[PDB]
Write an enzyme that holds these catalytic residues in place. Structure first.
Site, short mmCIF file in Angstrom:
data_model
loop_
_atom_site.label_atom_id
_atom_site.label_comp_id
_atom_site.label_asym_id
_atom_site.label_seq_id
_atom_site.Cartn_x
_atom_site.Cartn_y
_atom_site.Cartn_z
N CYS B 106 17.87 60.28 57.76
CA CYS B 106 16.79 60.46 58.72
C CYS B 106 17.13 59.92 60.09
O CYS B 106 17.37 58.72 60.24
CB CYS B 106 15.52 59.74 58.21
N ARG B 109 14.32 57.19 62.22
CA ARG B 109 13.93 55.89 61.63
C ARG B 109 13.52 54.80 62.63
O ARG B 109 13.01 53.76 62.21
CB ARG B 109 15.02 55.35 60.71
N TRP B 278 7.03 64.13 62.62
CA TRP B 278 6.90 65.24 63.56
C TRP B 278 8.29 65.85 63.69
O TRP B 278 9.28 65.23 63.27
CB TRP B 278 6.39 64.77 64.92
N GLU B 283 15.20 71.59 64.24
CA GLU B 283 14.80 71.91 62.85
C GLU B 283 14.13 73.29 62.78
O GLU B 283 14.40 74.05 61.86
CB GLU B 283 13.86 70.85 62.27
C1 HEM Z 1 8.41 60.69 62.83
C2 HEM Z 1 9.40 61.51 63.15
C3 HEM Z 1 10.54 61.96 62.20
C4 HEM Z 1 11.59 62.66 62.63
C5 HEM Z 1 11.85 63.15 64.08
C6 HEM Z 1 12.44 62.92 61.50
C7 HEM Z 1 13.59 63.65 61.53
C8 HEM Z 1 14.31 64.03 60.42
C9 HEM Z 1 15.37 65.03 60.39
C10 HEM Z 1 15.81 65.85 61.64
C11 HEM Z 1 15.83 65.09 59.14
C12 HEM Z 1 16.97 66.01 58.61
C13 HEM Z 1 16.70 67.48 58.95
C14 HEM Z 1 18.01 68.25 58.99
O1 HEM Z 1 18.99 67.76 59.59
O2 HEM Z 1 18.06 69.38 58.43
C15 HEM Z 1 15.10 64.12 58.35
C16 HEM Z 1 15.29 63.88 57.02
C17 HEM Z 1 14.64 62.94 56.25
N1 HEM Z 1 13.59 62.13 56.65
FE1 HEM Z 1 12.95 61.90 58.62
N2 HEM Z 1 11.89 62.34 60.37
C18 HEM Z 1 10.71 61.74 60.77
C19 HEM Z 1 9.84 61.10 59.90
C20 HEM Z 1 10.13 60.73 58.60
C21 HEM Z 1 9.24 59.96 57.77
C22 HEM Z 1 7.81 59.53 58.23
C23 HEM Z 1 9.86 59.75 56.60
C24 HEM Z 1 9.32 58.98 55.38
C25 HEM Z 1 8.22 58.24 55.52
C26 HEM Z 1 11.16 60.39 56.65
C27 HEM Z 1 12.13 60.41 55.65
C28 HEM Z 1 13.16 61.32 55.59
C29 HEM Z 1 13.94 61.61 54.42
C30 HEM Z 1 13.83 60.95 53.02
C31 HEM Z 1 14.93 62.67 54.87
C32 HEM Z 1 15.98 63.37 53.98
C33 HEM Z 1 15.09 64.44 53.32
C34 HEM Z 1 15.89 65.27 52.34
O3 HEM Z 1 16.85 64.75 51.72
O4 HEM Z 1 15.52 66.46 52.19
N3 HEM Z 1 11.27 60.99 57.88
N4 HEM Z 1 14.18 63.50 59.16
C1 XFJ Z 2 18.89 70.68 47.71
C2 XFJ Z 2 18.20 69.74 48.67
C3 XFJ Z 2 18.40 68.35 48.60
C4 XFJ Z 2 17.76 67.49 49.50
N1 XFJ Z 2 17.94 66.14 49.44
N2 XFJ Z 2 16.93 68.02 50.43
C5 XFJ Z 2 16.73 69.36 50.54
C6 XFJ Z 2 15.80 69.91 51.59
C7 XFJ Z 2 16.30 69.49 52.98
C8 XFJ Z 2 15.21 69.76 53.99
C9 XFJ Z 2 15.05 71.07 54.48
N3 XFJ Z 2 14.09 71.35 55.37
C10 XFJ Z 2 13.28 70.39 55.84
C11 XFJ Z 2 13.39 69.07 55.41
C12 XFJ Z 2 12.44 68.05 55.99
C13 XFJ Z 2 13.11 67.20 57.07
C14 XFJ Z 2 12.11 66.37 57.85
C15 XFJ Z 2 11.27 65.44 57.20
C16 XFJ Z 2 10.34 64.70 57.92
C17 XFJ Z 2 9.41 63.73 57.18
C18 XFJ Z 2 10.25 64.88 59.29
C19 XFJ Z 2 11.12 65.81 59.92
N4 XFJ Z 2 11.08 65.99 61.26
N5 XFJ Z 2 12.00 66.52 59.20
C20 XFJ Z 2 14.38 68.73 54.46
C21 XFJ Z 2 17.34 70.25 49.66
#
Ligand code: HEM
Ligand code: XFJ
Ligand code: HEM
Ligand code: XFJ
Ligand code: XFJ
Ligand code: XFJ
Ligand code: MTL
Ligand code: MTL
Ligand code: CL
Ligand code: CL
Ligand code: ZN
Ligand code: ZN
Ligand code: ZN
Lengths: 411, 407
Positions: B106, B109, B278, B283
């Site tokens: 993420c 963070r 957000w 994305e």
């Molecule tokens: C508030 C603004 C936030 C932004 C701008 C943000 C941004 C992102 C982005 C850009 C990704 C990866 C997307 C990609 O590269 O395809 C991501 C993944 C992730 N985010 Fe954040 N996020 C935010 C909030 C949060 C919050 C609130 C949480 C948990 C409370 C969180 C937990 C995670 C997790 C666990 C992943 C990996 C998800 C997965 O494996 O699919 N994020 N976030």
């Molecule tokens: C096979 C697999 C594994 C894995 N760990 N995640 C995925 C889905 C990855 C994925 C795709 N589109 C969207 C997201 C959400 C990313 C995201 C999450 C939050 C909370 C905020 C933000 N701005 N962006 C995550 C697929």
């Protein structure tokens, strides 16, 4: 063990068995991935296994595994090692070895071309003047008036580590960088330290923005010596844009031949500390990295300013817009001048075809995603969604420290 | 033990000591790096609980205190007798914040400590789940001034009574295989859409149909609910210079809310824990719009721009990409819906990472996900070395429930 990789755009799954031949270490453990860390005299004892592993690979590749010729070569090398503490590669083994180091180079997106490498054997070279001559010949052959051909020149191998051949330049052709008293840099900031060394060694610096550095060449562990590559052998391309006529007045140019000269080639346990190799550029290397890295020519602002982009906030994507236009300019200029260059879409599509072929014919293709994905437009290229496995096969190219850190000065 | 990371643009070097507290495995070995692979009882529970409670009490500067020892005692007794335990509200909030803090993929963070935690452990039915989720959605959305939130449903017990949100995100668009051979809508959601229809959803069969929630309470068969249309904030996509752009008929929703992951805290497993933040503009404009297996709009846009699409080297794809991403950001900003561009987001992450290194001794980060999917090297994360390792509390991937659920 079978390891699977998936492509997340196509759902195509491949199976890696080649990783079982991996030997050296990654830097990673079960607890920590070092995948984005840039840097994560042998004994008779260790050497013969390394030799044997190599010769078994070589003889398999020629469908002569277990032949009398194979057994006899093993016997021959065994006795050479125990009697002289090292051994000499046959020319065919040298060529095979160099080709395989490229095939195995996991950071290299251009490996579809690996079997087409001209190998220049410079193991008879004895002096820095000799090295200079070999390097000029490599440059002229590789440049080929703009129709670039991949080449490697291989200088004598390490013996005791006190008689190393080294090219002190990071690349055969690179531009000088000059730190000014006001803290600004003229030319290429990547090469300030080496430029200072050249000047200390007696180079008369023109002190401009694109001065081709002299070669600083070390033969047989002796102090290195300065040589100027004949200007007529250095092909350069002035950079212009197909629609923006003011782009030319930025005064940009780049050289056509990317030639890495600071790496170590390991074949069958032997170490070739001077092994300059060259191919041709992918456009983003010049347009993204060399021009737009903040610690390089750093031209984004000037370009964007000339384009009259809204530069008050990053969210107008002015940096992204300028970046694309610069890269268009590099590709246009090289193509207009008939100098080989590949765009990142073509290069990555070719790499994925190469990779799939390698999986089928070889059982794998080690690849470092961090370096393979282009530094702009990553996800719209077919490598971004490709899972890769990074592991180290030999023969290989390896990083070695810059020689000024380690060289024992004679005087 | 001590590990160094270097930034190759700024030469700044940082020392990581936090990785020594890493616990879960990475998938890599000394022989093979799997950095680019997407998916690489009473006895076990108490060490996990202790490890968590120790970090918690340390965090409130009460480590080794009687209140610390008393709590460890209490939890031990509860595990020995019930085979599980309940977190105090304070521990729940802390664990959720830290699961975000620890999410190595993420980039957002810097915001970790400002997470609104909604404790839904008293929820018992699918209807209850729906109410909690609508409330989360309205709270997080906040008329476009988005606020990070997580809603936490009851923990796993015997694994036969799991709470699950079957949706991958609270808000997402349906995908439909056409007799045509093509896909209408979002191809990412074709299978889930089918399950919805099979469970009785009346699909509108459009390009941007907000999916219904399919909610599973207490291991029961999941039930369908439609989110109130008025709680789903959407943005029509236009370009500040290209008038024709609006005629592509593109839109996206404002709220990214991941709903398919598992929250682990102190060995306890929360299988339903939707969380939201957000968007970063890329994305939507790079991934959702331009991935070949998604809305795949690059070709149509380049055509409207009348670019030379004959050769890849005109960089027509790259030009169209930038414009699409300009329009996404402009649209969200014009409608006053929170969004961050990749330059601003990555700069903030670097600032966060330096904070974490100085205050915590490190910050696990996965470069492959942290580097934006366009213009990578001109952002400050590209040249930053990162160490990836797994800390708990954590968010974990879990398989889609239809593979596992018994009806
Ligand atoms: C508030 C603004 C936030 C932004 C701008 C943000 C941004 C992102 C982005 C850009 C990704 C990866 C997307 C990609 O590269 O395809 C991501 C993944 C992730 N985010 Fe954040 N996020 C935010 C909030 C949060 C919050 C609130 C949480 C948990 C409370 C969180 C937990 C995670 C997790 C666990 C992943 C990996 C998800 C997965 O494996 O699919 N994020 N976030
Ligand atoms: C096979 C697999 C594994 C894995 N760990 N995640 C995925 C889905 C990855 C994925 C795709 N589109 C969207 C997201 C959400 C990313 C995201 C999450 C939050 C909370 C905020 C933000 N701005 N962006 C995550 C697929
Ligand atoms: C023929 C056309 C070639 C192209 C288009 C090409 C392209 C590239 C690119 C883009 C990189 C990474 C640069 C970066 O991401 O910053 C790279 C790295 C590398 N290439 Fe290739 N290359 C070519 C030829 C060769 C040849 C001929 C060899 C050796 C025989 C070679 C061996 C390597 C090695 C060892 C690296 C890693 C370099 C390092 O660690 O510094 N390449 N190549
Ligand atoms: C610390 C450090 C480690 C390492 N392994 N490499 C480097 C240098 C990386 C590097 C920088 N600029 C340029 C290159 C050359 C890449 C390259 C090589 C060849 C042969 C062809 C081609 N088109 N491109 C490599 C630095
Ligand atoms: C010795 C040395 C010192 C220094 N300050 N920078 C460098 C060059 C670092 C550098 C910068 N941009 C590009 C590269 C090429 C290597 C490279 C690195 C990464 C992370 C991704 C990718 N695609 N390629 C290398 C080398
Ligand atoms: C279950 C599932 C199946 C499928 N075929 N695709 C997906 C989405 C795959 C996917 C594609 N592009 C992007 C992402 C986001 C995660 C992601 C992955 C990578 C490699 C880099 C990066 N910056 N972000 C995910 C999920
Ligand atoms: O000016 C010295 C640098 O060019 C040199 O240290 C290189 O960055 C190094 O050889 C890595 O390629
Ligand atoms: O159609 C269902 C898919 O969206 C689903 O399998 C997701 O890809 C998965 O939940 C991971 O995000
Ligand atoms: Cl770069
Ligand atoms: Cl993507
Ligand atoms: Zn760079
Ligand atoms: Zn790894
Ligand atoms: Zn994608």
């Amino acid at each position: 063990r079978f390891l699977k990789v998936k492509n997340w755009e196509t759902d195509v799954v491949l199976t890696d068995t080649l990783h079982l031949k991996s030997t050296l270490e990654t830097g990673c453990t079960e607890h920590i991935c070092m995948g984005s860390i840039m840097l994560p005299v042998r004994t008779k004892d260790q050497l013969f296994p390394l030799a044997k592993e190599f010769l078994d690979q070589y003889y398999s590749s020629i469908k002569r595994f277990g032949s009398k010729a194979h057994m006899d070569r093993l016997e021959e090398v065994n006795k050479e090692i125990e009697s002289t503490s090292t051994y000499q590669l046959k020319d065919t083994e040298l060529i095979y070895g160099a080709k395989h180091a490229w095939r195995n180079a996991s950071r290299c997106v251009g490996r579809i071309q690996w079997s087409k490498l001209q190998v220049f054997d410079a193991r008879d070279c004895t002096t820095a003047h000799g090295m200079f001559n070999y390097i000029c010949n490599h440059v002229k052959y590789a440049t080929n008036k703009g129709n670039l051909r991949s080449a490697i020149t291989i200088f004598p191998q390490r013996t005791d580590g006190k008689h190393d051949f080294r090219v002190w330049n990071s690349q055969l052709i690179r531009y000088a960088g000059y730190k000014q008293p006001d803290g600004s840099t003229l030319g290429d900031p990547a090469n300030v330290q080496f430029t200072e060394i050249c000047i200390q060694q007696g180079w008369k610096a023109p002190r401009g923005r694109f001065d081709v550095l002299p070669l600083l060449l070390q033969a047989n562990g002796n102090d290195p010596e300065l040589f100027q590559i004949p200007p007529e052998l250095v092909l350069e391309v002035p950079i212009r844009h197909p629609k923006f006529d003011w782009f030319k007045d930025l005064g940009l140019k780049w050289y056509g031949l990317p030639a890495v000269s600071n790496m170590l080639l390991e074949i069958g346990g032997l170490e070739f500390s001077a092994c300059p190799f060259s191919g041709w550029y992918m456009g983003t290397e010049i347009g993204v990295r060399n021009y737009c890295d903040n610690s390089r020519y750093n031209i984004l602002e000037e370009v964007a300013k000339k384009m009259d982009l809204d530069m008050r906030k990053t969210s107008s994507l002015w940096k992204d817009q300028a970046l694309v236009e610069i890269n268009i300019a590099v590709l246009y200029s090289f193509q207009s001048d008939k100098v080989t260059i590949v765009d990142h879409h073509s290069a990555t599509e070719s790499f994925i075809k190469h990779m799939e072929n390698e999986y089928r014919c070889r059982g794998g293709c080690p690849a470092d995603w961090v370096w393979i994905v282009p530094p702009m437009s990553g996800s719209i290229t077919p490598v971004f969604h490709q899972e890769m496995l990074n592991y180290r096969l030999t023969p290989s190219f390896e990083y070695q420290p810059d020689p000024w850190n380690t060289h024992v000065w004679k005087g």
